[PDB]
Design an enzyme around this catalytic site. Structure first.
Site, PDB file in Angstrom:
ATOM      1  N   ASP A  36       0.772  -1.234   0.000  1.00 18.15           N
ATOM      2  CA  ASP A  36       0.000   0.000   0.000  1.00 18.15           C
ATOM      3  C   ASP A  36       0.815   1.301   0.000  1.00 18.15           C
ATOM      4  OD1 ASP A  36      -2.045   1.837   0.218  1.00 18.15           O
ATOM      5  OD2 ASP A  36      -2.366   1.514   2.366  1.00 18.15           O
ATOM      6  N   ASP A 232      -1.732   5.553  -5.444  1.00 14.78           N
ATOM      7  CA  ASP A 232      -2.078   4.631  -4.360  1.00 14.78           C
ATOM      8  C   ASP A 232      -2.426   3.202  -4.751  1.00 14.78           C
ATOM      9  OD1 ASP A 232      -3.063   3.453  -2.036  1.00 14.78           O
ATOM     10  OD2 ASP A 232      -4.808   4.779  -1.895  1.00 14.78           O
TER      11      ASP A 232
END
Ligand code: Z76
Ligand code: Z76
EC number: 3.4.23.46
Lengths: 389, 390
Positions: A36, A232
């Site tokens: 992440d 992201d």
């Protein structure tokens, strides 16, 4: 130039996330960890949970150190409650090093773990500024670089299959590569173009122009980065600020008007299916995002195909139809260049030179007529005005 | 008060249950029966047991009828095995009628009977759908209504003392009222607000919003009723679904943060004590549960005090301290509005109109600064979506 030991070390898919294998504790406790770039905490399930078939058992690790502190971490999607501590961590298919890093042992959670995802923790690769509870809790990558000689940089090649992957298939398939400390030239084609990391918290960048099939969306560029734009891997869709989202959907609808789809489709909630092999890719427009370049008044663009923004999903009838969900959605927290966008490119998070590089991915999905692209340069003025303050 | 004959006909307490006196057989055999709106079987001890000082003796009843069938009934708490039959049943301090009802004669049990509770059987007042072995075994209340002219409705006023009651005290004290066939206005103050009985099996309801000292718990309302929410006098605690429990405890701890309590307290396992009369009620928050109203997009709320969710218990050293246990715990079977919650209100089980009524109880425990409450209405949308569907 090449990092064979790290190539193909990722598994997963856009809708459930891409994860890398890691080990925590002594003796080593193997866990699959979600990659992440949109958060900065390293956390792992540390107690039984219906969606987990394994978790971090601190009492079985001789190197575990208790920080005697709890932390509550909520995300847009879900949240977890954890107990802070440190332990030795390694990445089997990564650099040959062991690091003592901070670890949040998850004891309670709500809508965080995903049933069938095969991952049991999360690896926040962003900067300390957004680490919880505060920036004093050093992020994993920061500890890695500080404790070893690994260059301050990592690159991600996320590979979308282009079709649905069933339970067993996704477990056996190679989902991509996370090259730690370098750039592997076999993962991309063409040239790498870099955009500056505006500020070191999220991997923040600045979008200066948006086109739908070459047609300028024509909005004040500040709208594209309101209140920020980030890269992201921890989010599936390309999420756009309310105002931009509405404009983009109207334009995408206009370009694909030869076929009408239910509102639920454009809301990213319901799927659309076509007889096997007949998906009308050509009626959907390509989307180009122009990014600020490293040279003054210079920008470059990355182009996405519907093969990227239409996410493959298995039909409710498991039929032989090719079905998809619209992977572009509305955001109230700025632009989010999620996994479906990253799947079209090899992305270099060059922390050392404070920049993000983009190149056409060697594993992106396309057809015989169009391809994703990274091209430049283009003359663009007052780009700094595109950033929001 | 229009049912003086039934007012104050209950005895007991939250931790051991509230019971009403009944008679079974001919001649009548008197027994104390646990009032349980959380199950649907009428069953009584029918053989010697260490915790029973009396039991149903079928061979002494001329009206006993053997159904020649055994039944195994397990609950979360404990279980029993018995022999099914029927006999004439009456409630001395109830309607003046006698009915022939099904009776499970308990011959074996495990962790069912409670030492010192003073009850020898259980009266399941819920619907036939959850009766054991199946819904063909007519529950007691169904028999009562069908055989008499008693209205299809009963109401309960469970009265917690607000302090510990020793063995002698609990036997001589009035524990509340069960009004069979009606509503007695002397048992409550303010107005009665009704929530729909979602489905007739347990007395199922739908909670649409939860607040801790006015602060919205802010969870998807479906979580509050996962997988169901019920009103259950047969359970002591307010039991909440795992995720709601975790959220509630976090918020309750936050509100009462000026005092730190050990994990054992929040787990509902260990008691906390304060010098006599000094319980810091004011640092603990009130809890409001919003329930679906009878009118579209309209809800109402019931608010309880720590005087309800902190259950009085005698100190292990029987000192002069005022001690309590946290009476809120987690559930894996949905929300359970137990006795400690019911103690704050007069609850009307209006079977005839498929609704449950709530009003501030005339016997709820409170202080000079706060009182329990039942207030409305409030605008609430998509409440139907708060209900869970398997
Ligand atoms: C692949 O995707 C998988 C599918 C399935 C489940 C989620 N999901 C999505 O596509 C999806 C959708 C939406 C609308 C949001 C998120 C989301 O919150 N992602 C998080 C990471 C995450 C992944 C999960 F799997 C579950 C989960 F709980 C969270 C990311 O770190 C977001 C967080 N925020 S912050 O402001 O909250 C935030 C800011 C600063 C610090 C923190 C701690 C959080 C900033 C942008 N980076 C994910
Ligand atoms: C006042 O309370 C007193 C104190 C002391 C001892 C028990 N107790 C509690 O507080 C307590 C705690 C917990 C966690 C559970 C119970 C519990 O099972 N209560 C039962 C009634 C009961 C009371 C007892 F006294 C002892 C006993 F064996 C049982 C109620 O009918 C529960 C049963 N279920 S079902 O799914 O099983 C169930 C569903 C459908 C049919 C049946 C047959 C069982 C549904 C909710 N309604 C009670």
């Amino acid at each position: 130039g090449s990092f064979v030991e790290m190539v193909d070390n990722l598994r997963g898919k856009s809708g459930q996330g891409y994860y890398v294998e890691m080990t925590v504790g002594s003796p080593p406790q193997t866990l699959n960890i979600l990659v992440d770039t949109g958060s900065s905490n390293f956390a792992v399930g540390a107690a039984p949970h219906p969606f987990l078939h394994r978790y971090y058992q601190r009492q079985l690790s001789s190197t575990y150190r208790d920080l005697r502190k709890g932390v509550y971490v909520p995300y847009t999607q879900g949240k977890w409650e954890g107990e802070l501590g440190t332990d030795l961590v390694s990445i089997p298919h990564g650099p040959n090093v062991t690091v003592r890093a901070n670890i949040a042992a998850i004891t309670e959670s709500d809508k965080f773990f995903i049933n069938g995802s095969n991952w049991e923790g999360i690896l926040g690769l962003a900067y300390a500024e957004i680490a919880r509870p505060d920036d004093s809790l050093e992020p994993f990558f920061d500890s890695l670089v500080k404790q070893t000689h690994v260059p301050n940089l990592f690159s991600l090649q996320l590979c979308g299959a282009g079709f649905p992957l069933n339970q067993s298939e996704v477990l056996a398939s190679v989902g991509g590569s996370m090259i730690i400390g370098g750039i592997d030239h076999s993962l991309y084609t063409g040239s790498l173009w870099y955009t500056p990391i505006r500020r070191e918290w999220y991997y923040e960048v600045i979008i200066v122009r948006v086109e739908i099939n070459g047609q300028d969306l024509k909005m004040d560029c500040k709208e594209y980065n309101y209140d920020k734009s980030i890269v992201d891997s921890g989010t599936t869709n390309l999420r756009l600020p309310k105002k931009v989202f509405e404009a983009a959907v109207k334009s995408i609808k206009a370009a694909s008007s030869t076929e009408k789809f239910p509102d639920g489709f454009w809301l990213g909630e319901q799927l659309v299916c076509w007889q096997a092999g007949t998906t009308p890719w050509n009626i959907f427009p390509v989307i180009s995002l122009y990014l600020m370049g490293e040279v003054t008044n210079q920008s470059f663009r990355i182009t996405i195909l519907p093969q990227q923004y239409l996410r493959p999903v298995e039909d409710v009838a498991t039929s032989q139809d090719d079905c998809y969900k619209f992977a572009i959605s509305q955001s109230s927290t700025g632009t989010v260049m999620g996994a479906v966008i990253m799947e079209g490119f090899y992305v270099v998070f060059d922390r050392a030179r404070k920049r993000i590089g983009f190149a056409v991915s060697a594993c992106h999905v396309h057809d015989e007529f169009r391809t994703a692209a990274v091209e430049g340069p283009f003359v663009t003025l007052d780009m700094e005005d595109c950033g929001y303050n």
